[PDB]
Structure formats: structure tokens, C-alpha cells
Scaffold this active site. Structure first.
Site, short mmCIF file in Angstrom:
data_model
loop_
_atom_site.label_atom_id
_atom_site.label_comp_id
_atom_site.label_asym_id
_atom_site.label_seq_id
_atom_site.Cartn_x
_atom_site.Cartn_y
_atom_site.Cartn_z
N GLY A 123 -41.10 108.48 -78.52
CA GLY A 123 -42.25 109.13 -79.13
C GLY A 123 -42.88 108.42 -80.31
O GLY A 123 -43.62 109.05 -81.08
N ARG A 174 -35.27 106.87 -66.37
CA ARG A 174 -34.63 105.62 -65.96
C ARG A 174 -33.22 105.80 -65.41
O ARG A 174 -32.60 104.81 -65.03
CB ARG A 174 -34.64 104.63 -67.14
CG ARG A 174 -36.08 104.36 -67.58
CD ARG A 174 -36.25 103.25 -68.63
NE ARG A 174 -37.67 103.25 -68.97
CZ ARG A 174 -38.19 103.91 -69.99
NH1 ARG A 174 -37.40 104.55 -70.86
NH2 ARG A 174 -39.51 103.90 -70.16
N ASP A 206 -47.78 96.95 -81.74
CA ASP A 206 -46.94 97.78 -80.86
C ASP A 206 -45.97 96.91 -80.06
O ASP A 206 -45.69 97.14 -78.88
CB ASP A 206 -47.84 98.65 -79.96
CG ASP A 206 -47.07 99.51 -78.96
OD1 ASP A 206 -46.18 100.28 -79.35
OD2 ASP A 206 -47.40 99.41 -77.75
O1 LIG Z 1 -42.70 103.88 -78.98
C1 LIG Z 1 -42.16 104.65 -78.15
O2 LIG Z 1 -41.47 105.64 -78.50
C2 LIG Z 1 -42.28 104.39 -76.65
C3 LIG Z 1 -41.74 105.02 -75.51
C4 LIG Z 1 -42.03 104.52 -74.27
C5 LIG Z 1 -41.24 105.46 -73.35
O3 LIG Z 1 -40.57 106.43 -73.78
O4 LIG Z 1 -41.20 105.21 -72.13
C6 LIG Z 1 -42.85 103.43 -74.17
C7 LIG Z 1 -43.38 102.82 -75.32
N1 LIG Z 1 -43.09 103.31 -76.56
C8 LIG Z 1 -44.26 101.62 -75.20
O5 LIG Z 1 -44.67 101.14 -76.22
C9 LIG Z 1 -44.59 101.09 -73.91
O6 LIG Z 1 -45.31 100.13 -73.77
C10 LIG Z 1 -44.01 101.76 -72.70
C11 LIG Z 1 -44.16 101.47 -71.37
C12 LIG Z 1 -43.40 102.42 -70.69
C13 LIG Z 1 -43.21 102.52 -69.20
O7 LIG Z 1 -42.20 103.17 -68.81
O8 LIG Z 1 -43.99 101.92 -68.41
N2 LIG Z 1 -42.79 103.28 -71.57
C14 LIG Z 1 -43.16 102.88 -72.82
PR LIG Z 2 -44.35 102.01 -78.45
#
Ligand SMILES: O=C(O)c1cc(C(=O)O)c2c(n1)C(=O)C(=O)c1cc(C(=O)O)[nH]c1-2
Ligand SMILES: [Pr+3]
EC number: 1.1.2.-
Length: 562
Positions: A170, A110, A296
Site C-alpha cells: 500500500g 502470489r 517509485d
Molecule cells: O508500494 C507498494 O506498496 C506496492 C505494492 C504492489 C503490490 O502490492 O502488488 C506493487 C507496487 N507497490 C508497485 O510499485 C508496482 O509496480 C507493482 C506491480 C505489481 C504487479 O503485481 O504487477 N504490484 C505492484
Molecule cells: Pr510502489
């Protein structure tokens, strides 16, 4: 050549943006008004820059601009420095990634931070890397966590009081979330704060770790057994900073595993906003958006400071549009709940919020325990786990007083199953199918009044929205769509006023700045993120949307501005 004072001045200096969020608080508001509703029709691309490498997938970076140079990241842990006027590449850094990186949700990044003569970013194998701004060569690199345990970094880092701060990602792998501060010049660790209750935080002096209090006081208070050892709560989106309170505002991920029946208790500090002292990483307050999450509903979504007056009384507020469907307004001095209200049209898991902001749960909307069967009962839940809003940031317009929220309308079938933790493997214990709630649209860009608690306007999109928002003093709101457009809307009415087809889904948060008396707008394009592999029936809607990887730069010519 980026000082802390310079960072604190964003977005006051028209020629540069040296922060993720156009200011440390993350309001994503530009005070530039050369471009406005009456001349945005004259905005056009002036150059583009392909990331190359046969490495596409999601492109989520917000560029930073300093001294006429743009600094941005790409998928697969790459950094680019690009001349802002011409698009010419200055240098590029490609991190060497191992084959066993473990991002849950695409190989996204990002953005960078800037401090001194360095450019910083986090890698998909959970390193923090400092690059020379002029040459792109590595100056230092530190392992933040062990990628073989499921850690990665996807967020842009931040500079606070001359300290470089990063979270980790993670939770879907049962990592222990933690926030870390580093000396930007040499990568020396300064402090570390776990986001899961029961883990010790530290400060570091002369290379030695010094205990600095257990997060949440004591292990086992809101987690059973040793479940807190794999509790998740990853602060994977980064955070923002409020100079008035001198607090970092950091959200935290879902508790692990997804099967909530294995972890009775509120599961602190998962799905929470934390305010931390940047001096030492101590948690000063917390607000838990989804206690004992079963869906979640990560609580990472950005907490954006803003001020308003109520009874003639000055309110130091902060707003967040949560994965769980509620839009929260908190007192940012102490974390206390002010108001909270749905910003999507359907919520099944809670019927409302109590006086403290805790959900009033609809227990029929939590998937049941498997018990003697392989799977438990399947329930239909809204929002889907991908959320009423996900990673993509909302923006605050100081003139309208509204937040502009890229939201999604979808639900899910979800069920739970047994799951044993294995280091480096997925740690879900759930199955699911995301489904649309409406035939003709999923994404909805919404203007929200955080004081009245009212939606002011909405704009529907066929595909989900998955991109950050920018708003400006010219009464404009910019955001991208998976259909490939960068789009601009009237900030007061929501009418579309301009768009451009970039050729691949746009996720990047747009940025705007001034050079040689002309206003520029830039966005990165390249479809990806969680939706293609997690989106269920909704992913099928967008299955034919092609990948990409390109920085787009637009300008309003000076002679067409009047
Ligand atoms: O629980 C986590 O550690 C973690 C990390 C990420 C991430 O690092 O991008 C997402 C999620 N969860 C998550 O739940 C999620 O829906 C998600 C969507 C995205 C994305 O960039 O489209 N990252 C993440
Ligand atoms: Pr998640």
C-alpha cells in the site's frame, strides 16, 4: 502434515514443493533432471483447471504441491486445492471482499504457505487466513491492517522457525509498511516490525504488546516533520530466509509520496533490503538500493542467497535485480555491498555506484519541484517506474552459476505535483507516461553471472516480461510471456527449446515436481498486473491481450524420457 523440517528440506524431496521459491532461500532451482534439453520437446499438457467466477485479471501464484495436492491462489483473494494428477477440484475458498479494497496494481495474489494441516494466504483487504487443507474451511482469520487506510496483501506468506510471516502492501496510499509474525496454529500475533523509521516495533506476550525498539532508532532522522507517519516502504513482495545466518531477507517498497521534494532525506527504510531476526523481528542489517527515491523504484525485489568461492574464501552472498536497473550482490551475513552493475541497457537516474553501493545520482534525471506552477518540470527517466524488474522472481541455476532475470527495457516521462495526504486515497504527487526504448521489444530474459558481473545471454520479447522464472538441473529455464506462452530455454545458451500457447498472458512462477516416476511442470495463466493500467504507451502494445485464469499442468511421459 507439513513440518518445519520438511520446509527446510525443499527442494530435496522430488514429490513435493512446500515453499514459495522451491526452498526457503528462493533460488527457484529444481534438482530434477528427468526433463532436459533433449526431451523437452515431448512435454505436453495433461490437464487444466479454470478459476471461473467471471473473475480474471492477473494470476501470479506459484502453486505448492504436497501429498499429490496442489494449493494455489487466484485473483480476488481465492484459494484452490486441486488434485495434482487429474486436475479435479478438491475445494475452493472465495474470500468475501469489501467493495473498497485498495490494491494499487490489480487484484493479484502470489500464493499460499503450508504448515501442519493448514493453508495460509493474505487477502486483498489485509487479512491473514488459515484454511483446513482437507476441507478448505476457515480455521482462523486475523486483520493484519486496516484496508480503509490503503493496506492490502498481495504476497505469499512464509514459514520460518514455525512462525507464519507476512508483510503488507500500500505504499501508493501512504500506508506504514510493517512485517508481522503469527503462531500458525491459532493466529496469535508474535511480533511486528515497521519498515518506516520512527515507528515502534513490538513483541507480544500473553496478548499484551511489549515495546521492542523504534525502527531506525528515532523518528525524524531521515524524514522531515511527520512525513514518516505516511512513509510507505511497504514490504509487499514477501521475502525469503537463509538458514545459515538465520535471517529473514525482506525488501521494502518505495517511500511515499512519489513527490520526493516533500520528503528530503534518505527516507529509511524505504527501497531497502532488510535482514531480520525471526525470533523477535529486530532488524539486523539493511541495504538501501535507492536512497531518497524519486521514481517509485520499490526495493522489494527478492534477495536470493547463494554461495561461491573467491580467493579460496567462501562467500555467503545474496543477489537482487532491482527496480532501479542495478543488479546487486551483497554479503548476506552483514549486508555489506560486494558488487553492483546495470542489468538493463539504459539507466539515466544514476551514473554508477560508490564503494558502499550508494548511487552516484544524475540530478537532472529527478523531476523538479512544482514550486509556483501546478506541475514541475517533466524529465525522461530510465528505467520506468515499473522497473528494470518488478515483482516477478528471478531464478538461480546451481550448475551454471547464473541468475535468470525477467527484465524490461522502458523509460518514462515523469513530473511532480503537490499532494496532500487523505486517508484511503492515492498519495502520489506525480504524473507519468511510460514509453518503450525500442521499437521491436520490451521484455528481455537475461542470464547474469553474479561473480564476474557479466551478462551471458539475452532473449528479447515484444511485450514486457511479467512472470516468474524456474530453472532446473536439466539445463532448462522456464518463464511465461504476456503473449500467452510458457517458454523453455537452454540455460547455457538462451536458445528457445520449447513453448506452449496457454491462451492468456502467463505471470505465474513455474514449478516442477515428480509423481509416479514422471516429471510435471505447472504454471498459472491469466494476463494482468500493473502494466494494463500503469503502462502508458507500452500498455497500448498489449491492449488486445485477453484475460484468463487457469492452472496448466504439463508432463513428460515416462516412456519418452530417454
Ligand atoms: O508500494 C507498494 O506498496 C506496492 C505494492 C504492489 C503490490 O502490492 O502488488 C506493487 C507496487 N507497490 C508497485 O510499485 C508496482 O509496480 C507493482 C506491480 C505489481 C504487479 O503485481 O504487477 N504490484 C505492484
Ligand atoms: Pr510502489
Amino acid at each position: 502434515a507439513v513440518s518445519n523440517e520438511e520446509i527446510l528440506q525443499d527442494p530435496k524431496n522430488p514429490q513435493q514443493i512446500v515453499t514459495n521459491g522451491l526452498g526457503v532461500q528462493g533460488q527457484r532451482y529444481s534438482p530434477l533432471d528427468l526433463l532436459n534439453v533433449n526431451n523437452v520437446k515431448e512435454l505436453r499438457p495433461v490437464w487444466a483447471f479454470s478459476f471461473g467466477g467471471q473473475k480474471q485479471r492477473g494470476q501470479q501464484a506459484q502453486p505448492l504441491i504436497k501429498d499429490g495436492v496442489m494449493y494455489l491462489t487466484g485473483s480476488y483473494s481465492r484459494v484452490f486445492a486441486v488434485d495434482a494428477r487429474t486436475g479435479k477440484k478438491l475445494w475452493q475458498y472465495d474470500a468475501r471482499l469489501p467493495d473498497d479494497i485498495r490494491p494499487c496494481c490489480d487484484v493479484i495474489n502470489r500464493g499460499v504457505a503450508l504448515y501442519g494441516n493448514l493453508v495460509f494466504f493474505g487477502t486483498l483487504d489485509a487479512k491473514l487466513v488459515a484454511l483446513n487443507k482437507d476441507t478448505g474451511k476457515v480455521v482462523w482469520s486475523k486483520k493484519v491492517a486496516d484496508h480503509k487506510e490503503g493496506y492490502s496483501i498481495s504476497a505469499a506468506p512464509m514459514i520460518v522457525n514455525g512462525k507464519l510471516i507476512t508483510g503488507v502492501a500500500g505504499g501508493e496510499f501512504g500506508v506504514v509498511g510493517k512485517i508481522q509474525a503469527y503462531n500458525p496454529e491459532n493466529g496469535e500475533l508474535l511480533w511486528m516490525r515497521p519498515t518506516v523509521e520512527g515507528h515502534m516495533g513490538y513483541v507480544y506476550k500473553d496478548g499484551k504488546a511489549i515495546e521492542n525498539g523504534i525502527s531506525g532508532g528515532e523518528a525524524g532522522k531521515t524524514w522531515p516533520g511527520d512525513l514518516w507517519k505516511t512513509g510507505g516502504a511497504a514490504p509487499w513482495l514477501g521475502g525469503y530466509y537463509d538458514p545459515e545466518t538465520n535471517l529473514i531477507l525482506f525488501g521494502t517498497g518505495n517511500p511515499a509520496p512519489w513527490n520526493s521534494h516533500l520528503r528530503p532525506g534518505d527516507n529509511l527504510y524505504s527501497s531497502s533490503r532488510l535482514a531480520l531476526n525471526p525470533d523477535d523481528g529486530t532488524i539486523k542489517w539493511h541495504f538501501q538500493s535507492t536512497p531518497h527515491d524519486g521514481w517509485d523504484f520499490d526495493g522489494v525485489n527478492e534477495l536470493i542467497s547463494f554461495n561461491y568461492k573467491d580467493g579460496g574464501k567462501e562467500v555467503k552472498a545474496a543477489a537482487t535485480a532491482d527496480r532501479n536497473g542495478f543488479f546487486y550482490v551483497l554479503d548476506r551475513t552483514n549486508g555489506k555491498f560486494i558488487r553492483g552493475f546495470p542489468f538493463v541497457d539504459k539507466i539515466t537516474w544514476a551514473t554508477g555506484l560508490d564503494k558502499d553501493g550508494r548511487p552516484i545520482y544524475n540530478d537532472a534525471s529527478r523531476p523538479g519541484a512544482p514550486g509556483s506552477e501546478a506541475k514541475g518540470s517533466s524529465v525522461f527517466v530510465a528505467p520506468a517506474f515499473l522497473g528494470a524488474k518488478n515483482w516477478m522472481p528471478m531464478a538461480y541455476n546451481k550448475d551454471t552459476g547464473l541468475f535468470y532475470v525477467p527484465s524490461n527495457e522502458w523509460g518514462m516521462d515523469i513530473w511532480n505535483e503537490g499532494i496532500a495526504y487523505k486517508k484511503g486515497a492515492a498519495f502520489l504527487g506525480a504524473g507519468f507516461t511510460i514509453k518503450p526504448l525500442n521499437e521491436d521489444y520490451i521484455g528481455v530474459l537475461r542470464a547474469i553471472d553474479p561473480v564476474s558481473g557479466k551478462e551471458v545471454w539475452r532473449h528479447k520479447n515484444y511485450a514486457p516480461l511479467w512472470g516468474g522464472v524456474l530453472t532446473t538441473k536439466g539445463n532448462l529455464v522456464f518463464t511465461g510471456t504476456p503473449e500467452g506462452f510458457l517458454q523453455a530455454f537452454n540455460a547455457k545458451t538462451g536458445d528457445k527449446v520449447w513453448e506452449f500457447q496457454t491462451g492468456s498472458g502467463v505471470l505465474g512462477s513455474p514449478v516442477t515436481w515428480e509423481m509416479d516416476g514422471e516429471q510435471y511442470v505447472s504454471v498459472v495463466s491469466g494476463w494482468g498486473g500493473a502494466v494494463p493500467l500503469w503502462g502508458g504507451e507500452v500498455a497500448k502494445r498489449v491492449k488486445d491481450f485477453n484475460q484468463g485464469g487457469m492452472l496448466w499442468t504439463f508432463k513428460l511421459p515416462k516412456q519418452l524420457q530417454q
